[PDB]
Write a protein that holds these residues in place. Structure first.
Motif, PDB file in Angstrom:
ATOM      1  N   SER D 153      -5.599  88.958  44.019  1.00  0.00           N
ATOM      2  CA  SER D 153      -5.499  88.823  42.565  1.00  0.00           C
ATOM      3  C   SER D 153      -4.724  90.010  42.019  1.00  0.00           C
ATOM      4  N   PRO D 154      -3.395  89.938  42.033  1.00  0.00           N
ATOM      5  CA  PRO D 154      -2.591  91.082  41.590  1.00  0.00           C
ATOM      6  C   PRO D 154      -2.622  91.261  40.081  1.00  0.00           C
ATOM      7  N   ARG D 155      -2.659  92.525  39.663  1.00  0.00           N
ATOM      8  CA  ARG D 155      -2.646  92.895  38.247  1.00  0.00           C
ATOM      9  C   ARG D 155      -1.196  92.915  37.772  1.00  0.00           C
ATOM     10  N   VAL D 156      -0.632  91.718  37.610  1.00  0.00           N
ATOM     11  CA  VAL D 156       0.766  91.609  37.215  1.00  0.00           C
ATOM     12  C   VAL D 156       0.912  91.905  35.728  1.00  0.00           C
ATOM     13  N   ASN D 157       2.064  92.457  35.359  1.00  0.00           N
ATOM     14  CA  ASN D 157       2.367  92.814  33.978  1.00  0.00           C
ATOM     15  C   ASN D 157       3.611  92.054  33.543  1.00  0.00           C
ATOM     16  N   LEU D 158       3.471  91.245  32.499  1.00  0.00           N
ATOM     17  CA  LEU D 158       4.571  90.486  31.926  1.00  0.00           C
ATOM     18  C   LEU D 158       4.691  90.812  30.445  1.00  0.00           C
ATOM     19  N   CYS D 159       5.924  90.929  29.962  1.00  0.00           N
ATOM     20  CA  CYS D 159       6.158  91.166  28.545  1.00  0.00           C
ATOM     21  C   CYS D 159       6.454  89.843  27.850  1.00  0.00           C
ATOM     22  N   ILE D 160       5.896  89.678  26.654  1.00  0.00           N
ATOM     23  CA  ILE D 160       5.980  88.421  25.925  1.00  0.00           C
ATOM     24  C   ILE D 160       6.954  88.504  24.752  1.00  0.00           C
ATOM     25  N   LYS D 161       7.173  89.693  24.194  1.00  0.00           N
ATOM     26  CA  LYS D 161       8.069  89.867  23.055  1.00  0.00           C
ATOM     27  C   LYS D 161       9.494  89.453  23.412  1.00  0.00           C
TER      28      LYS D 161
END
Lengths: 516, 141, 191, 663
Positions: D153-161
């Motif tokens: 379960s990787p703590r992925v970071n995605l930007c939404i702006k």
């Protein structure tokens, strides 16, 4: 003209978008956005698919999310059409397997990112979960892909992808069961106990569906384990050269022989070779998957822990039924009440067949212990226990050795059998603690003890009833007070005579058989 | 500009009435000047897998005529034809086999995978596509 | 040096076969390994009269004789494309269909595993048999598919509609799909 | 054990782990007594029970025998104390200075697979921080294990702006126009949109800023009324906020649409009350869709204030507001969906009940809904429902003055002698989710398809048949339209509850009537798999009726699978031997012959099989039949229980095999 030239140049446009240059990627990203806003069909699902089929790093997923966020304010129905286009490209001859493996990985990361947090995923109304669940029947056969990376990515996705709130159609439910059990066995073979987490998660997730799915998962899981292609993990199972070497005995005289009996020597015979660490740990992985599947819902987190979660008496009933189906499909002695002792002399072929089945595959015994820890369950395996017991009776009738340690497997099978029936609340604790003397007796003596066991099961049968569902801590309990026999009078008398014979060696263990 | 309202109706279509009426209109105005079907590619892809039999037949016939105008686009309708060949609706597959030999000629570069999937669908699924695939073989040489 | 010995032996066998055809009939009734079937057919002209007893060889009760007859007929039809060869090819297709009606599963595998490349040869030799050939394939395909559903399998090929020591049924299904692949790629590149 | 000092037993078991002295079977027996006497009533024993189970399993993993199912049972819910005690016992169990390499390998492998068994990460952490785990494994495998554990379960970071390729200090009027426009298009927060609009109208002179994004769409009557405000700022603001709210409601962003329509509510208050009532109708739309989508089928009930406001909307009756019909669509759909069977006859007066046909159809449908729990006829409601539905499926002109074909019901979409068009009827029934009204409408359309359209013999199944039999003016109803709408209704009703056996039977019958035998067999098998748990128990006779099994036999026969016909015709209450013998006589089966002979349990059919194989020359299938007859399980004179249990075993295995092939 610029927009509808990039309409058919969108492939190279997005292909050079993913480079992440200094300031070029923002320009081409807005170029893609205005393209997919402009074009009359959409050209947004194709752009999202290309951004998803080639993303190999988290930041380019991030650019994909900005593309969807910039597009959702104007267009609609983007992600379902994008996934239709992607999966149609997968199932056709295009989208060469690294691209689809990458795409399934990116989808798994996205739909896992949805089911976390809430500051970010709730801002973008993406609904990756419902869109991915809509294509579940299109997504199940990718677990059967020849390339290992595609199958692994599909396994991770199906492990994390939520099911429809619509529930699941039984055809695609069964297909998911087949894909799950095959992926579990194949990943068990290739990688090992590290690498089956996705398949075990998928199987234990769709085991907690409607109970038909639970029976399907348990049945296919523990009959695929006894198949020839998978039982090796869990235990195991001319004329020129003729005429060049025909000198001496021939000539003008007849040849020496009269013929060949068959085709010659019967092979050179194969020698099987295993290593016990892989055997024990693949068995550990399978029993862990079963004990996850056969467990109840739970999820209370009450008390100070230190406790045993219940194994369901219905799931273990399904495991017991399919185990009886796998070992002996016959229906001659299918009644759960034991017949008289002399009746064991009739169906001796069936008894030898169950004995052979228990001898060849050790996992059967292991499965019995799984049936053991749910006390209404082993009653359904009365045919199996009766047949194996009758085979052991035959072996101890035919044994001539002075000590029972000369036959290892039959001693182990007898002690394990009576231990399992003592686990399942079939025998009393006084009579069920006899196997610790079996290692140092005579074959007729252990024969008389097993006949005492058979007589007790005559007098007090292994019926599905006579268990009370005690409800404060809801479990089935058989209390040996109220049947009227209690501890078996003649049976404990014979067992005590057995102890009273071999005082010379059964001295210390005489304290276990004291009356309660 | 002359094709914008019809394709706006085709894209924003929910009921079988609107789709069938627009398909009848576009068939009527594609009988003459048949080069107007290049714009109706993605919507024809989406509507070719529709479950209603009449609109699906109209979409299939329009797609085949659009191949007949210019066969260079037959490599673009391949994923949809492969999806229709291997779906679970049991009517998209039969309409796909009914139009199988014409598209088999009109593709001629990916006919192997098409006929391969035709054999597996008719083999694992209990139905008889042998006449259509064999006729495509005889006229394919 | 192998080819020189092969062609010299082919010369001697051609002389012995034209000396008396009874030896040729007796040998083809006895049988030889199938890897010699190209070399024996391409290199010995006298095998043309071998098309005289393929109806008789295919009618023998022995089964491996029938596989040998089918394979020998296929290589002959590759070599000599005659109306006689096409007629005996139609007879071969009818015999394979009849044996599909009458065969036990183990004997069905033992019969249909070594034959199926001969169907590629038959289809390559003669266009007018295509659909007939195709019919046999689809029939054998689904009957093998039904057998796959009879018992549990370690590969589950029914849901594999996308693309060692295994179960014989999945091997037979794989042989059927590979011979269909070979027929299709023969037809595509056959001009 | 006699006294009760169980901790003393725990250190004895640790010493036995160190020494390998006591017999293993004695330890298993002691574990048995501790489990049993834990089940006899004391709740203080489960701690000792886990401790002795850990001692027994570590003994088993030293001596290399299996891991007990009890150990897997006690780590269903792991805890800090459990893993701490396991590590403590494993540390005391092995003496590293005098251990063999096999013992270290066994302990390392046990620790590795215990790490693999855990799912929550901090347990993997403190089981990887113990000195035993570091000492017993070299560092590369430890890092490999940690790496594959954090990969789950990787703590992925995605930007939404979204992208804003903006350069600071534009110093240009048109460029700044573009920046504020792109911000205006992207913005969803209404207060920010207000800032953009006020600055944009402040810097510009007389430019209207609603014609700035063509994807914004407003309904025609609402667009007519919304362009009537005098002030430019209010026109642009209310127009683009209501368009954005409608688009957000379209794209299932309900909370943002709620905030947008709330800002619309607080700003429209000054100008007009007509626009106020319009936009409260919009609020009702948003609330209805949010309740039907957010809570879904798992929601407990409507919150009983939304019921009041929809109840009011059906009785607003202000004639100076525009009213789109989709509001009334969701009103009647919500009124029928959540089973309120009280707004049918006592309430909802006729005083414009008949103006909205949606209200009338929902009233008639709810009237037929309440009739069914009455074991009694009272069938005025079913009668008028039958009339209104045969009239909606009717063509107006008898001899077709416009175009001569009747099929123009699907083409002309005009000329219906009904209160509503058929496309709106499909739109209405596609918005209903309650099973009882949906199966009422399904039985209605099944009955309307079963009125001998020209000639039809195979009647499709129907769960209740209470409708009038004789149809007046049968020439009026277009029957291909009935076929199209019943296919729509069935395929939709599969998307409301796919695990409903009656609907699957209806779909199978419709596929059988249209000569689609493979799909009919697939859905019949699917219904059998719904009603019985994938054929683990016997299928009840109310699902596989004799008609259903006979249709399955016909489907198998027309697909040239004849052994399946024989097996499937053993299933009937009376065994149909004639069709069995006729099917087995043929020589073109596309299913297996010999491997289906295990699913037969009748001596008569096996007798015929042996006779056929002896006549026709099968010398090897005959022996298979002889082996089948000669079984001591299928004798005719067995006790009846043995015969019926063998029969149900073969039924289960054969039906599972069919579900293996199809389905």
């Amino acid at each position: 003209p610029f927009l509808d030239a990039l309409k058919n140049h969108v492939g190279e446009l997005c292909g050079e978008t993913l480079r992440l240059e200094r300031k070029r990627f923002l320009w081409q990203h807005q170029l893609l956005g205005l393209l997919s806003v402009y074009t009359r069909p959409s050209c947004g699902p194709e752009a999202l698919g290309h951004l998803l089929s080639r993303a190999r790093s988290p930041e380019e997923l991030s650019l994909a999310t900005q593309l969807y966020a910039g597009l959702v304010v104007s267009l609609s129905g983007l992600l379902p059409l994008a996934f239709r286009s992607c999966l149609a490209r997968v199932h056709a001859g295009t989208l060469q397997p690294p691209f689809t493996a990458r795409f399934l990985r990116n989808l798994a990361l996205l739909v896992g990112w949805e089911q976390q947090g809430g500051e970010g995923p709730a801002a973008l109304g993406a609904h990756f979960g419902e869109s991915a669940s809509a294509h579940l029947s299109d997504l199940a056969p990718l677990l059967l892909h020849p390339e290992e990376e595609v199958a692994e990515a599909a396994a991770s996705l199906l492990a994390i992808c939520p099911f429809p709130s619509e529930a699941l159609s039984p055809s695609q439910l069964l297909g998911l069961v087949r894909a799950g059990v095959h992926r579990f066995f194949a990943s068990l073979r290739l990688h090992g106990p590290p690498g089956v987490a996705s398949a075990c998660q998928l199987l234990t997730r769709l085991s907690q569906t409607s109970p038909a799915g639970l029976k399907a998962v348990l049945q296919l899981l523990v009959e695929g384990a006894l198949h020839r292609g998978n039982t090796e993990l869990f235990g195991g199972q001319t004329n020129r050269r003729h005429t060049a070497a025909v000198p001496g005995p021939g000539g003008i005289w007849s040849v020496f022989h009269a013929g060949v009996i068959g085709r010659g020597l019967k092979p050179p015979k194969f020698v099987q070779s295993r290593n016990q660490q892989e055997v024990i740990y693949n068995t550990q992985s399978l029993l862990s998957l079963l004990v996850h599947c056969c467990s109840a819902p739970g999820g209370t987190e009450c008390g100070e822990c230190w406790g045993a979660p219940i194994l369901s008496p219905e799931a273990a009933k399904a495991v017991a039924v399919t185990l009886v189906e796998s070992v002996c499909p016959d229906a001659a002695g299918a009644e759960l009440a034991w017949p008289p002792e002399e009746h064991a002399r009739a169906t001796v072929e069936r008894d030898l067949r169950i004995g052979r089945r228990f001898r060849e595959q050790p996992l059967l015994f292991e499965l019995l212990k799984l049936v053991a820890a749910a006390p209404p369950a082993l009653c359904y395996c009365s045919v199996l226990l009766r047949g194996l017991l009758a085979a052991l009776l035959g072996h101890w009738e035919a044994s001539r050795h002075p000590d029972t340690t000369h036959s290892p497997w039959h001693l182990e099978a007898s002690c394990t059998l009576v231990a399992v029936m003592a686990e399942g609340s079939l025998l009393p604790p006084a009579l069920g603690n006899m196997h610790e003397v079996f290692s140092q007796l005579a074959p007729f003596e252990v024969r008389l003890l097993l006949l005492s066991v058979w007589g007790f099961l005559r007098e007090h049968g292994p019926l599905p009833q006579k268990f009370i569902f005690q409800s404060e801590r809801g479990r089935f309990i058989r209390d040996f007070s109220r049947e009227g026999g209690g501890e078996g009078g003649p049976h404990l008398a014979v067992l005590h005579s057995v102890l009273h014979r071999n005082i010379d060696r059964l001295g210390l263990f005489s304290g276990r058989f004291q009356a309660p | 500009a002359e094709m914008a309202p019809y394709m706006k109706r085709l894209s924003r279509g929910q009921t079988v009435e609107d789709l069938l009426e627009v398909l009848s209109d576009i068939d009527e105005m594609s009988r003459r000047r048949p080069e107007i079907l290049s714009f109706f590619s993605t919507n024809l892809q989406r509507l070719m897998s529709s479950a209603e039999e009449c609109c699906r037949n109209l979409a299939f016939s329009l797609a085949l005529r659009s191949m007949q105008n210019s066969p260079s686009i037959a490599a673009a309708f391949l994923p949809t034809f492969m999806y229709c060949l291997g779906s679970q609706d049991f009517e998209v597959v039969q309409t796909a086999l009914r139009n199988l030999p014409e598209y088999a000629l009109l593709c001629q570069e990916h006919a192997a995978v098409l006929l391969h999937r035709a054999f597996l669908v008719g083999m694992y699924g209990q139905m008889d596509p042998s006449a259509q695939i064999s006729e495509a073989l005889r006229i394919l040489h | 040096n192998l080819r020189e010995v092969q062609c010299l032996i082919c010369c001697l066998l051609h002389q012995m076969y034209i000396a008396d055809p009874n030896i040729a009939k007796l040998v083809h009734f006895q049988g030889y390994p199938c890897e010699l079937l190209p070399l024996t057919v391409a290199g010995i002209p006298s095998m043309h009269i071998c098309l005289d007893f393929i109806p008789e060889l295919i009618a023998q009760p022995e089964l491996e004789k029938q596989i040998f007859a089918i394979q020998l007929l296929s290589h002959l039809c590759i070599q000599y494309a005659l109306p006689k060869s096409l007629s005996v090819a139609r007879l071969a297709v009818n015999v394979m269909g009849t044996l599909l009606t009458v065969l036990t599963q183990a004997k069905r595998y033992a019969f249909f595993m070594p034959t199926l490349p001969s169907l590629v040869s038959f289809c390559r030799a003669f266009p007018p048999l295509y659909e007939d050939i195709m019919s046999l394939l689809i029939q054998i395909g689904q009957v093998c598919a039904s057998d796959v559903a009879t018992q549990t399998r370690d590969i589950d090929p029914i849901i594999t509609r996308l693309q060692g020591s295994m179960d014989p049924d999945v091997q037979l299904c794989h042989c059927i799909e590979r011979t269909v692949i070979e027929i299709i790629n023969m037809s595509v590149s056959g001009i | 054990l006699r006294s009760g000092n169980y901790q003393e037993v725990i250190q004895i078991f640790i010493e036995d782990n160190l020494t390998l002295s006591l017999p293993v079977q004695f330890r298993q027996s002691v574990l048995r007594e501790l489990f049993k006497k834990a089940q006899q009533g004391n709740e203080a024993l489960d701690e000792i029970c886990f401790k002795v189970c850990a001692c027994n399993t570590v003994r088993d993993i030293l001596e290399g025998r299996t891991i007990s199912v009890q150990f897997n049972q006690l780590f269903l819910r792991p805890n800090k104390e459990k893993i701490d005690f396991l590590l403590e016992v494993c540390s005391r169990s092995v003496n590293l200075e005098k251990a063999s390499e096999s013992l270290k390998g066994n302990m390392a492998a046990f620790l590795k697979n215990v790490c693999l068994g855990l799912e929550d990460l901090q347990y993997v952490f403190m089981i990887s921080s113990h000195e035993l785990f570091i000492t017993l494994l070299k560092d590369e495998e430890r890092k490999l294990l940690v790496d594959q554990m954090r990969k789950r379960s990787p703590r992925v970071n995605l930007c939404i702006k979204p992208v804003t390729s903006f350069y600071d200090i534009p110093a240009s009027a048109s460029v700044n126009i573009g920046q504020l426009e792109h911000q205006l298009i992207l913005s969803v927060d209404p207060w920010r949109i207000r800032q953009i609009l006020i600055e944009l109208h402040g810097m510009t002179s007389e430019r209207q800023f609603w014609t700035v994004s063509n994807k914004w769409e407003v309904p025609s009557v609402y667009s007519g009324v919304i362009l009537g405000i005098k002030d430019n700022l209010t026109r642009d603001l209310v127009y683009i906020l209501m368009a954005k709210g409608l688009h957000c409601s379209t794209v299932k962003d309900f909370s943002h649409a709620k905030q947008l329509f709330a800002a619309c509510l607080e700003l429209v208050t000054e100008f007009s009350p007509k626009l106020r009532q319009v936009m409260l109708n919009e609020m009702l739309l948003l609330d209805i869709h949010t309740h039907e989508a957010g809570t879904g089928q798992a929601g407990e009930r409507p919150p009983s204030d939304l019921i009041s406001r929809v109840r009011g909307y059906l009785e607003m009756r202000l004639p100076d507001i525009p009213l789109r019909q989709v509001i009334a669509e969701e009103c009647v759909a919500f009124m029928l969906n959540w089973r309120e069977n009280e707004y049918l006859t006592l309430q909802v007066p006729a005083f414009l009940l008949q103006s909205n046909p949606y209200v009338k159809l929902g009233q008639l449908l709810a009237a037929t809904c309440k009739e069914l729990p009455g074991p009694k006829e009272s069938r005025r409601t079913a009668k008028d429902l039958w009339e209104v539905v045969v009239q909606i499926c009717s063509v107006s002109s008898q001899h077709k003055r416009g175009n001569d074909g009747r099929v123009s019901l699907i083409k002309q979409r005009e000329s219906t002698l009904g209160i509503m068009y058929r496309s709106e009827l499909l739109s209405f029934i596609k918005k209903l989710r309650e099973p009882l009204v949906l199966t009422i409408i399904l039985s209605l359309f099944v009955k309307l398809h079963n009125v001998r359209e020209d000639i039809v013999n195979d009647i499709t199944a129907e769960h209740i048949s209470i409708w009038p039999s004789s149809i007046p003016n049968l020439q009026s109803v277009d029957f291909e339209a009935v076929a199209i709408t019943v296919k729509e209704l069935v395929r939709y009703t599969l998307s409301i509850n796919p695990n409903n056996h009656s609907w699957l039977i209806i779909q199978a019958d419709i596929y059988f009537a249209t000569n689609q035998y493979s799909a009919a067999l697939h859905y019949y098998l699917q219904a059998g798999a719904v009603c019985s748990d994938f054929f683990n128990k016997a299928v009840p006779p109310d699902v596989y009726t004799d008609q259903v099994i006979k249709r399955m036999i016909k489907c198998c026969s027309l697909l040239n699978c004849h052994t399946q016909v024989a097996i499937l015709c053993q299933f009937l209450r009376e065994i149909d031997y004639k069709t069995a013998f006729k099917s087995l006589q043929e020589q073109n089966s596309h299913d297996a012959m010999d491997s289906y002979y295990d699913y037969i349990w009748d001596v008569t059919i096996l007798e015929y099989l042996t006779y056929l194989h002896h006549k026709r020359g099968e010398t090897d299938k005959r022996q298979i039949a002889i082996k089948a007859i000669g079984q001591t399980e299928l004798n005719a004179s067995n006790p009846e229980e043995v015969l019926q249990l063998a029969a149900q075993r073969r039924k289960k295995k054969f039906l599972q095999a069919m579900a293996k092939l199809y389905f």
